[PDB]
Structure formats: structure tokens, C-alpha cells
Write a protein that binds this DNA or RNA. Structure first.
Length: 206
DNA sequence: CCATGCGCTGAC
DNA sequence: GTCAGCGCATGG
């Protein structure tokens, strides 16, 4: 049983694994938080993240992608999501993710002196990210492997407010689940969409 | 205690 | 199509 602050792959969970709901991704240990896009500790780093089209500044290009930090939002009224209404800060999860980069934390942003030496980050792609990405799975959530933070920096987002941006690159020995090799691999391993026990039946009665 | 939150579902 | 909020895990 891996501790909550484990870095790297989760034993027994191969690249290409799929789950229908976020709570299922949590139970596997791959990505503990069931709502937040980032799982991290401000004095340690980020352990994993999910691409789900929640932030307009996100850019997905497969082996490379640009992630936005969280926050700069007014969640008053017991919300979990909203548009940008204030500038983001390099604290909490945003600070946790910056620490993965192989360079001293820099309030103004920084680049890695040999990205590969950075802390590994488990990445999950959710289907809501398919609206603006051809890498997103058609259904559910999919584990795509290990990535590293090549660099991060602040800049005015499409909303006009300041947002934190991270450039992540894949560093995994397993073929991408979206390539020919990946799709064959998933087939040879017999991986299939996992659903909560009783879910398919409950939804079939409808 | 107290904030944060890239989900999810039932309503208009 | 879009939207108002709710339980709960995680961290400090």
C-alpha cells in the first residue's frame, strides 16, 4: 500500500488503465483527490494531475502539454468551479507543482537544469478534455504515464488575469496509449473500461 | 478548526 | 445548453 506522498508509478497499474469516474481513480492511488486537478504538498511536490478541460489556458499536445495552476477563482456559494476573477498565486498546489521542476523554486518562474532529474508526476486524461484535445479518451479517465515539469512561469491568461503555467513532457518507457503501439499494447493486456460495481446495471434499468 | 476544489447530478 | 450547490478527501 503506497503512502499518499508516493512519487512515481503505482504497482500493478499499467499505462492505459481506464476508469469511468474520478473516485475510482482515487481508490487506485493514481490520483487521490477526487475533485482537485493536482495532488501535492507545498513542501514536497505534486504526485499527479488530471487534464479535464477545466481551465481555458490548458494546451494538450500529447508528449508535451501546458497545464494551468488552480485558483484565481471566487468559489463563494459553496462551488468547486468558476471563471477566473483574480490573479493566481504560487502557493498550495501551484507551489507543489513548481517544486517538481529540477531548479530552485522561483517566484518569477524557472526552467530545469536537466528536466529528467525532476520529480515524476502521474498524469490522467479525462474525456472532458476531448473537446479541445485529440489525445483525450473517448470515455472516462485514462492513465497516460509519467511526465516531468520542464519549466513554469506566470502570464496574463485569456481572461486577462494572471495564471501560472507549467510545461510538462512525458518520460515513460511505455508507449503512449493514443498511438498505434499504445492501442495494441492495451489490447494485448486486455485492459478495458472499469465501472463502479453495479453501475452498468443501474444505468441499464434506465 | 478552516480553506481549497480540472466532479457530478438533478433542475429549469 | 447551462446552471446552482452538495458530500467529502486532503492538507495545514
Amino acid at each position: 500500500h503506497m503512502p499518499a506522498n508516493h512519487f512515481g508509478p503505482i504497482p500493478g497499474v499499467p499505462v492505459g488503465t481506464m476508469w469511468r469516474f474520478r473516485v475510482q481513480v482515487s481508490e487506485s492511488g493514481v490520483h487521490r483527490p477526487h475533485v482537485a486537478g493536482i495532488h501535492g504538498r507545498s513542501n514536497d511536490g505534486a504526485y499527479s494531475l488530471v487534464l479535464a478541460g477545466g481551465y481555458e489556458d490548458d494546451v494538450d499536445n500529447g508528449n508535451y502539454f501546458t497545464y494551468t495552476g488552480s485558483g484565481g477563482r471566487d468559489l463563494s456559494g459553496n462551488k468547486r468551479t468558476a471563471g477566473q476573477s483574480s490573479d493566481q498565486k504560487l502557493t498550495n498546489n501551484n507551489r507543489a507543482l513548481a517544486l517538481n521542476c529540477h531548479s530552485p523554486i522561483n517566484e518569477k518562474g524557472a526552467e530545469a537544469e536537466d528536466w529528467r532529474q525532476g520529480k515524476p508526476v502521474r498524469v490522467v486524461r479525462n474525456m472532458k478534455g476531448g473537446k479541445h484535445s485529440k489525445y483525450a479518451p473517448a470515455e472516462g479517465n485514462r492513465y497516460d504515464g509519467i511526465y516531468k515539469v520542464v519549466k513554469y512561469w506566470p502570464e496574463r491568461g485569456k481572461s486577462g488575469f494572471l495564471v501560472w503555467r507549467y510545461l510538462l513532457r512525458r518520460d515513460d518507457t511505455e508507449p503512449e496509449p493514443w498511438t498505434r503501439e499504445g492501442k495494441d499494447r492495451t489490447r494485448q493486456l486486455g485492459l478495458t473500461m472499469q465501472y463502479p460495481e453495479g453501475y452498468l446495471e443501474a444505468l441499464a434499468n434506465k
